[PDB]
Amino acid sequence: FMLAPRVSAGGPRNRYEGKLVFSPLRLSKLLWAIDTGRINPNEVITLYHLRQANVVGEREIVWPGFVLISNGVRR
Amino acid sequence: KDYSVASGSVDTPVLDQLVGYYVNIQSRKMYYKDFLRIEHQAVRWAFADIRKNSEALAHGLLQTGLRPGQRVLAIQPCNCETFVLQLACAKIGALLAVVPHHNISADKLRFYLNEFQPHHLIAREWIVVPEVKQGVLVERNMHFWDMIYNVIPELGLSYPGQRFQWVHSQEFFFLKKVVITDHNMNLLGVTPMRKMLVWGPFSYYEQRLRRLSALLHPDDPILALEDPHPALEDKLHITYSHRNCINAGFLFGNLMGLKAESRFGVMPNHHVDPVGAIVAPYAALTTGAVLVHIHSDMFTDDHAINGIEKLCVEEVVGMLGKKSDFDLLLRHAGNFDADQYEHLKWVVLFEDASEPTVGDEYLQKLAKELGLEDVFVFRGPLESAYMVMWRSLKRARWEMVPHVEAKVVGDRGTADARILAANTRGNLKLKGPHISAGYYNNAGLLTELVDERGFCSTSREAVMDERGQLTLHGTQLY
Amino acid sequence: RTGVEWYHRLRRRGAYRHWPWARWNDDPVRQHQELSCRRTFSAAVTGANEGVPLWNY
Amino acid sequence: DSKASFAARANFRLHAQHRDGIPSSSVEMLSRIEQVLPPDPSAVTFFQTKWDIQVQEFYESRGMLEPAAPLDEEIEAILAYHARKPSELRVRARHRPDGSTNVGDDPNFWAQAEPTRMMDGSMLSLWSRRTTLGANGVPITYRR
Amino acid sequence: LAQHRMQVWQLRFKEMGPPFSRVWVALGGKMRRRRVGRQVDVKDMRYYWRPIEPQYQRLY
Amino acid sequence: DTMFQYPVYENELDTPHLFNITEPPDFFVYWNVSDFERTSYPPLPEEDHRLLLPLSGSAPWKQHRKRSLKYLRKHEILPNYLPHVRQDVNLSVVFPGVYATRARLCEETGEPLPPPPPVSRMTHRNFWMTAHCGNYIELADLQHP
Amino acid sequence: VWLGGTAANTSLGRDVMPSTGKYINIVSPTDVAANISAGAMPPEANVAAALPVPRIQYSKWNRALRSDVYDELLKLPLRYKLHDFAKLCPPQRCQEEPEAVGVVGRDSAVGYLPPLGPADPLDTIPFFVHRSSNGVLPGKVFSMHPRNLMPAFYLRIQQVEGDMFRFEEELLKIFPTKKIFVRSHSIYVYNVALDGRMVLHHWLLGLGF
Amino acid sequence: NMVALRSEANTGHMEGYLKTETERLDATGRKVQKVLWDPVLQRHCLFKETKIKGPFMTKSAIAKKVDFPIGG
Amino acid sequence: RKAKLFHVVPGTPVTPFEKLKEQRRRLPEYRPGNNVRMDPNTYTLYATKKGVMTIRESRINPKYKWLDVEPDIQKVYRSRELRRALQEREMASMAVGENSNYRVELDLLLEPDWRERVMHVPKATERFKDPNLFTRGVVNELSPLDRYSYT
Amino acid sequence: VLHKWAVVSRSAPPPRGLRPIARTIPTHPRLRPVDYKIPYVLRTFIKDRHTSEVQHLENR
Amino acid sequence: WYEDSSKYAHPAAGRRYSHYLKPPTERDFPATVEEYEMVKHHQKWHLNQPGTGTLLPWHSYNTADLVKRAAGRL
Amino acid sequence: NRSLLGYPLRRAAAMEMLYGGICIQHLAQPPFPLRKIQSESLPPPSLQGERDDLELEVKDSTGNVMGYRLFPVNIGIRARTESVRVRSEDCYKRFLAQKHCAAAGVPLQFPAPSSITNSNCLATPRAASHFHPPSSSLSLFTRPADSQGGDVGRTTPADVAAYHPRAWRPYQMLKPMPHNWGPAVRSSGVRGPHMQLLQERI
RNA sequence: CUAUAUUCUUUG
């Protein structure tokens, strides 16, 4: 490992206090959850409703909460 | 009134494509309809012609050795072809530089050659320049050929290998061709080895201009103009892009009013500032109109009178200019009949913000003397293509040009800078489609900040009024 | 044929697991399509140019 | 200058077997003419022509729909190459999409265009190759 | 619990991969002793991320 | 200067100068705005060939027909679209061209320009308006039979 | 050394200029092409190469049903005929715009449909397959010995309830080469990755579950 | 010997240069200067000889203010 | 020392990325042939195109050789396949240049005099031809520096 | 060479069309051609390069 | 909140004091002879650009909590 | 016939020789003879030849070089590379707008129309022919909000002008700011706020 | 490894 140089004194993928590392929430997961019948379409969907409906686990939750990613969804 | 920020209406549509695209569209829609009229060059062109010979000239420059990265330098005096070159250099994405010819020597020519380092030099042999005899402006035919051979002495020493040596001048090594433009009235064409091929199909399988145009982006700067009052030491030639020009033209054409085949005049010698270079011809292109050139120059009484005698024939329903050459029209308009001006309805004068405030009694004088319905005054810094705010004769209020935000901020921020108190001098930031944040320099193409909020630094300090009014200043020197 | 990597490219091991990356049965020149002109104007002589040699043979 | 006339005009070959879409009299006449002619021309001469607006008026005045020239392929490839992130072309794993392991000693293998998929390609001996086709019709790389 | 993830690895490398195949990648040192005189190609063969040798990867 | 020379053909029937383009060598190129209305067609050759009777013993006809066949081969008509070409007769398909660059209209009305009188005899003015082997004719003049 | 040549002159589409005079005392592109000091620039340096674009991946949260995989199910000598592929996909976009649509069969961009029932009546399927509590179909792709991170994978099918051996006897037809094992709660298919999972799901959806 | 050819257009771009034995020879009292590609400007510029260990942008590296003939 | 070898089988198709031969600096043993590029410092042979590599030996001195890469692979493939098939059917002739035992004779019966054409030294007056030939254009090339015959 | 997948990527390379690379006789005495004489020609120095590369030419 | 409250400075505030919640002094001009000397030196240090009036320190943190986007789609 | 030097010798040298070393006779030289080029001896026109005769700089794997020369120099390199990547991304997205809009016969509009891209994704055989729109359908307006007009609904707040459907926010941010890191520099790079700074505890 | 080099480049 000493043959390899150091880079970026903190380290490449390094956490620091206040790096925004989001856990992903795929839009497909959400739409599946809505069309499956976990969640109200009628209602503003907060992170709270996601946790309560069980669609996201406690372990997944960390600061900052989530990112909405569109994975395999064209409409 | 409370704070220094100004915004125009956003309902006006914005054109984001390349220039060639709108040229093709406008060529398909109105093909046979007139585009520009010039009597002194015998040029009557349709949109057919402008498309056809624009891309033809593009191919001409491609075979003359021009490439999408490099620059062109153009000293042409009020021709049609400098506009054609705008379009051609737009199609191949080469930066065109237009420099004013009214004071030109060998020294500043070689300065331009040092600065832009152009591939091409678009020049003349005999050019018409104003000079002072007996306190009176008289035309001189400056022999520009002498100037070129003074700047580059090595073209005279001719050994019988030297059309083909790699560098024509060891001291300008980026010069490859010089395009001489003079109207030689001989009917015989020139020999094809000094003439570039402008006609016919340039290809077999597909033309390479639309293979290239996919690789060009609408914000690629192509044009450069002088700033006679530079914001800073650094900003020499402020630089324009596709959508800057297109949207300047469209905003002007939308704001005044322009309907197809209506006639639209330009006072000469405005091709070096964004009046006849940018606003006018693109206004004529974008909406259907007919651009009209009056006499090739302005600065003398004789061809001022010839100017009136032409514009009254050409049936121009409205024309553009600046105060200083409307002075000459005001001198010599009294000598003619009133009803001769019956077709002129509106007129436009453009203002750099360091002028400040052409007086409304002067506008009243124009309107009463020419029998005008309305006189329109546009004002803005030269980065903004001479339009930020505008007023009419009947409306003294300064209305903002749509899609324009002018703010005056503090010095402690970039994006997060705060609006001042509406009388206080602070930095000026302009956000608009027709505004340019690039400027060309000795160093090369340069850019000042375009931030997260979308605003853009001008490196100028300004004072906002309670009623919409901008006053530019030099930098604060305590 | 000695050496370490020649042992890896014969027993085709973990850099060479698919050895020669240019191997028979691919041709870059024709892409395995026959160059024959069926495009003939009159449909009678369609098979007129056939057996035009691709090389000396 | 009719429609079906134009269709038969655009699809013409000389000694054709059957011709559909045209009225019968014209078909019979063409049959006569092509029975008369030999397959071999006595003189051949050809010119070349560039597009102009008379094409448009030809298609629009007759209420037809003008054909367009498709965009270039290699320009699309160039744009698709220069558009992607620098981290799209780096090495993403121990195994190249072929299934071969890339040991770091060789610079040819420091680039990866297509992402490797370890959990795909187990079904290819049992399946038709038409499954391998990508979104644009180019076969994607599977681990074998 | 994390005792063995030592930071001298975390400064040098970074792991990249899809599940069940992941490289650890590093940059090259030849650099900060002699740059000049060698050649530009052999110098900028140093700016690429590269997978570590598999023994070392297994070992770490 | 055998290595430095602007390309000169002897048979421009393909009008290659429109297609194979070589840069003007001269450092000062002269480009007016007038030359946009100049049609750039190749110069009139000597030995106008379309007057030739296609006699089998005639040398100019021999060299012309071998030229035409080679032109047919380089544009890949001869092997490909049209496998067997017997060259018997000397053919000229001529068009009533006005040499006008783009499509025009009438200034007096706004009509399309009327169909020109069909050409009676071939002239030198008519020469590039024919169909040659390989050349280029504008679309604007091909509008009529 | 007189540096000159006809190279600087742009020649478009074929160079007809005399070729003995091209570059004079200047290195040609061929001279730098045979002389480069690097070696073997990588296969990904080819810019114009037409690279594949993957289709939309089948995930557990996205059922993107491919028609060709389904056709490779339809070629098999299976019993228990399947719903035609048009029915496994949800109703269309422009048909579903207004309030005129039913509640069970609603438009879903992910695509999710409640089980359609058997494609043929008057016939009894020996097994019955349960969806998960979240609507997911039972196949799970594990790895044999995940600690060493082995690429070797398998497929575990749990929620089968019925005669499981009929399930396996059709699963043989789906997977002729692979290894199948039976246990009270589950059915193992060996050396089958997400591909076979996609298939199992196409077959179970087509079967009416 | 090891010297640094640093841009005369002051971008602080330097390029390591090894003097030829003639230039290694003390025969002449001059700093070497050479036309090279300056990537920072994307242009060709003059480079000057300067010591490799030292700040490549020094204060003394400021050009005096030159008014340009062009424009008003 | 190090062992410097072939990285491909000669007579087998090869991609551009793969090395052909690693030489040792001594004129090199192997010189670049058609569609082959040599690293000037390393003397390592690379393939320009993608095709079949074959070895030429110089007719002058058999120990000095060229590596060639022939661009179309399937030509070589079906030529070799047919050739082999014939070999098994006893229908092939052993007189082709592919036969290494025969190539001497093959070069001999085609051009018998290639010895005396190689040994023939031109004088300076025909090596250096009077340039006005080149100026007037009687000859189109003037190349004083090819005095040596490489075949 | 730095491809686009590097860590650092540089600016545009010099356009080939300007300031070419001369084919110079190698000054290395082992790589120098035998007949190449050390060029002593006693000459008045012509300081501009335009004429000074004409001396290297025979076009008459 | 940004487009209503935050992006506007204090109504009294001068350009130099713009960022402060309340202007520390009345007059915008630097109110200390030492501070004035320093501002003069700053305006001749950096050449005379518009923003040079306000002192910005020559040295940096290189810390991640002050850094913003280098370049990206707006 | 043949000559002992092979070319007919010009009179200048001749009369110069038999009036020993004197050129006063013909000094005005005739122009050189032409070499005619056979136009049918040329190869058939090739497509790739048409592709590369222009010699564009975009086929380099180092990056979009043409992009660099069309871009300002005022930006630190590591922030400029990811800038030029953004313009070469927009040229791609626009290339795709062109393609899909041409594929459905619709006049061009760009971010993208949805219904065009998605429905053209439903046909593999739609790649054959493209049709132009009629001249009536052709308009200058390439944004959807300029084209589609108003539709009834909007969600984002009305009090903010930045959320206006026709509002124009510039396409890319341009910052003159330098980049903070390079590999050959030892202590450089962006540090955690409570990490020790560069050269702390000297 | 630590210091001097702080843009695409550089020392022991």
Backbone φ and ψ of B118, nearest 5° = -75, 155
**Phi, psi angles (nearest 5°) of residue K4:** -120, -60
The DSSP bridge pattern shows strands H2-7 and G186-190 to be unpaired
Tell whether I19 is within 8 A of chain C (Cβ).
Answer: no
- Tell me how crowded residue K1 is: count the other CB atoms within 10 A of its CB: 6
Side-chain-side CA neighbours of residue G52 (13 Å):
18
DSSP I114-127: HHHHHS----HHHH
Amino acid at position B270, single letter: H
User: In a 10 Å sphere around its CB, with 0-12 CB exposed, 13-18 middle and 19+ buried, how is residue B149 labelled?
Assistant: middle
Tell me, rounded to whole angstroms, the distance of Cα C23 from its chain centroid: 9
Euclidean distance between the first and final Cα of chain G, in Å?
Answer: 83
8-state DSSP, B289: -
* Tokens linked to B91: 């199609």
SS3 label, residue E14 = strand
Collapsing DSSP to helix, strand or coil, A4 comes out as: coil
Distance of CA L108 to the CA centre of its chain: 20
Reading the block at residue F138, the tokens are 């504008």
Nearest one of B327, B321, B396 to B357, comparing CA atoms = B396
Cα end-to-end span (Å), chain E: 16
Q: How far apart are CA F37 and CA F22, in angstroms?
A: 21
Chain Cα centroid distance, residue D56? 25
Contact list, A5 vs chain E (CB under 8 Å): 12, 26-29, 31
Tokens in use for B250?
């469209």
Where helices occur in H9-55 by DSSP H, the ranges are 21-24
Amino acid whose CA is nearest the C1' of M7: L76
How do the residues of chain L divide into helix, strand and coil, expressed in percent and rounded to 5? 30, 5, 65
Report DSSP state, residue B239: E
**Residue at G132: amino acid letter:** S
Phi–psi pair at J31, nearest 5 degrees = -95, -5
Task: Give the span between the Cα atoms of B330 and B327, in whole angstroms.
Answer: 5
Of chain L, the end-to-end C-alpha distance in Å amounts to 95
Handedness of CA B250, B253, B259, B262 (dihedral sign): negative
Find, among B31, B51, B86, the residue nearest to F36 by Cα: B51
Count the helices and strands in chain G (H runs, E runs). Answer: 4, 9
What does the DSSP assignment read for L13-74?
HHHHHHTTT---S--SPPPPPP-EEPSSSSPPP-HHHHHHTT--STT-TT--HHHHHTS-SS
Q: Is the Cα torsion angle L66, L71, L72, L75 positive or negative in sign?
A: negative
Q: Among candidates B162, B273, B257, B242, which has minimal Cα distance to B438? A: B242
Pick from G40, G72, G193: CB nearest D119 = G193
Where does B202-345 show beta strands of DSSP type E? 221-226, 237-241, 263-266, 290-293, 318-321
Tell me the two tokens of residue F62. 């021999």
Q: Give the three-state DSSP class for B463.
A: strand
Judge whether F5 is closer than 8 Å to chain I, CB to CB.
Answer: no
Specify whether the CB–CB gap between F138 and B56 falls below 8 A. Answer: no
Report the phi/psi class of residue I137: left, alpha or beta, with left for phi > 0 and alpha for psi in -120 to 50: left
In 3D space, the residue among B181, B174, B168, B59 whose CA is nearest the CA of residue F26 turns out to be: B168
Distance CA L62, CA G47 (A): 10
Question: Given the structure tokens 């200390």, which residue do they identify?
Answer: K32
Q: Which residues of I100-111 are buried (b: 16+ CB within 10 A; e: fewer)?
A: eeeeeeeeeeee
Nearest one of A38, A69, A67 to A51, comparing CA atoms: A38
CB A71 within 8 A of CB G169: no
Q: How many other C-beta atoms lie within 10 A of the C-beta of residue K31?
A: 11
Interface test with D, best of E23, E45, E57, E58 (most D CBs within 10 A): E23
How many Å apart are CA B183 and CA B77, to the nearest integer? 13
Which secondary structure element, helix H or strand E, spans residue K40, and what is its range? helix K33-45
Give the count of beta carbons closer than 10 Å to the beta carbon of residue B331: 12
Structure tokens at I111: 């051009």
Q: Distance (Å, rounded) from C-alpha I24 to C-alpha I43?
A: 7
Chain J contact for L23 (CB, 8 A cutoff):
no
Q: Identify whether the C-beta of residue H51 lies closer than 8 Å to the C-beta of residue B208.
A: no
Who's near L4: CB < 8 A, 6+ residues apart? Answer: none
d(C-alpha B221, C-alpha K14), whole Å:
36
Residues from chain H contacting residue B117 (CB–CB below 8 Å): 43
The CA distances from residue D134 to B84, B223, D117, D119, D121, in Å, are 45, 43, 14, 17, 14
Quick one: how far is CA G7 from the chain centroid?
Answer: 51
Terminal Cα-to-Cα distance of chain I (whole angstroms):
32
Q: What is the resolution of this structure in A?
A: 3.4
Residue F135, φ and ψ in degrees, nearest 5 = -75, 180
Q: How many CB atoms lie within 10 A of CB B20?
A: 24
Nearest C-alpha in C relative to F76: C37
The answer to whether the beta carbons of residues I33 and I68 sit under 8 Å apart is yes
d(C-alpha G92, C-alpha G189), whole Å: 35
Q: Looking at chain B, how many residues does it have?
A: 478
CA distance K52 to L198: 27
Task: Show the tokens assigned to B337.
Answer: 């009949």
B211/D50 CB distance under 8 A: no
- Helix%, strand%, coil% for chain A, nearest 5: 20, 10, 70
Our measurement of CA B399 to C1' M6, in angstroms, reads 48
Name the residue among G58, G55, G34, G92 with its Cα closest to residue G205: G58
Q: Shortest CA distance to G108 belongs to which of A73, I136, B162, I61?
A: A73
| Contact between F47 and F60 (Cβ < 8 Å) | yes
- State the CB neighbour count (10 A cutoff) for residue D18: 6
Q: Are J17 and G21 in contact (CB under 8 A)?
A: no
DSSP H or E run through B446: strand B445-447
DSSP D104: T
Residue L164 DSSP SS3: coil
B40-51: b (≥16 Cβ within 10 Å) or e: bbebebbbbbbb
Of chain C, the end-to-end C-alpha distance in Å amounts to 33
Which residues 53-82 on chain D approach chain G with CB closer than 8 angstroms? 73-74, 77-78, 80-82
d(CA E17, CA D108): 19
How far is residue B440's CA from residue B115's CA, in Å, rounded to a whole number?
A: 9
Judge whether C2 and I3 are in contact, CB under 8 Å. Answer: yes
Name the residue among F64, F41, F52 with its Cα closest to residue F126: F41
Burial environment of residue B15 by CB neighbours within 10 A (0 to 12, 13 to 18, 19 or more) = buried
Distance of CA G72 to the CA centre of its chain: 13
Identify the CA nearest to B474 among candidates B354, B317, B304, B297. B354
Residue F29: strand pairing partners: B179
| CB burial string B67-103: b at 16+ within 10 A, e below | bbbbbbbbbbbbbbbbbbbbbbbbbbbbbbbbbbbee
**SS3 sequence of G113-125:** CCCCCCCCCCCCC
Q: What is the DSSP string of G15-34?
A: --S-GGGSEESB--HHHHHT
Please give the span between the terminal C-alpha atoms of chain K, in angstroms, as a whole number. Answer: 20
- Please state whether G114 falls in left (phi above 0), alpha (psi between -120 and 50) or beta: beta
Positive/negative CA dihedral, I70, I75, I78, I84:
negative
Long-range contacts of range J46-52, CB-CB < 8 Å, 24 or more positions apart? Answer: J48/B154, J48/B170, J49/B170, J50/B154, J50/B157, J50/B169, J50/B170, J51/B157
Q: Where are the alpha helices (DSSP H) in B19-75?
A: 19-29, 47-63
Query: Mapping DSSP to helix (H, G, I), strand (E, B) and coil, where does residue L185 land?
Result: coil
Placement of tokens 């020597």 in the chain? B105
Amino acid at C5: E
User: Where does E1-60 have alpha helices with state H?
Assistant: 7-12, 40-43, 54-59
Amino acid identity of residue C22, one-letter, is A
3-state helix, strand, coil in chain C (%, to 5): 5, 0, 95
CB B166 within 8 A of CB G3: yes
Query: CA distances (Å), L131 to each of B23, D67, D69, L99, L104, in order?
Result: 20, 4, 8, 11, 8
Three-state DSSP class for K21?
Answer: coil
**Residue I105 structure tokens:** 């004779």
Q: Return the structure tokens found at I76.
A: 């070589």
Give helix B242-255 / helix B279-286 axis angle, nearest 10°.
70
Answer yes or no: is E5 a known binding residue. yes
H helix and E strand count, chain C: 1, 0
Which of chain L's residues have a Cβ under 8 Å away from the Cβ of I132? 5, 7
Beta-bridge partner residues of I36: I47
Report whether G106 contacts G137 (CB < 8 A): no
Look up residue G170 and give its amino acid: E
Q: Which two tokens stand for residue B359?
A: 């007086």
Q: How far is Cα of residue G69 from the mean position of the Cα atoms in its chain? A: 9
Q: Which tokens hold the place of H72? A: 């008003």
Q: Which of D47, D49, D50 to mutate to test the interface with B (most CBs of B within 10 A)?
A: D50
The answer, yes or no, to whether the previous bond of L107 is cis (omega within 30 of 0) is no
E10 is in an annotated binding site: no
Under 8 Å between Cβ of B299 and B331: no
Which amino acid does the sequence have at A30? Answer: L
Cα distance between residue B236 and residue B445, in whole Å? 11
Q: What angle do CA G34, G38, G41 make, to 5 degrees?
A: 90
Q: Do residues F137 and F99 touch, judged by C-beta distance below 8 A?
A: no
SS3 G161: strand
Regarding beta strands B120-123 and B71-74, do their DSSP bridges make them parallel or antiparallel, or are they unpaired?
parallel
Closest-lying nucleotide for L179 based on CA to C1': M7
Residue in chain A closest to E7 (alpha carbons) equals A11
E10–A4 C-beta distance less than 8 A:
no
* Experimental technique behind these coordinates: cryo-EM
End-to-end CA distance of chain H: 49
Look at the block and give the residue holding tokens 């009597």: B39
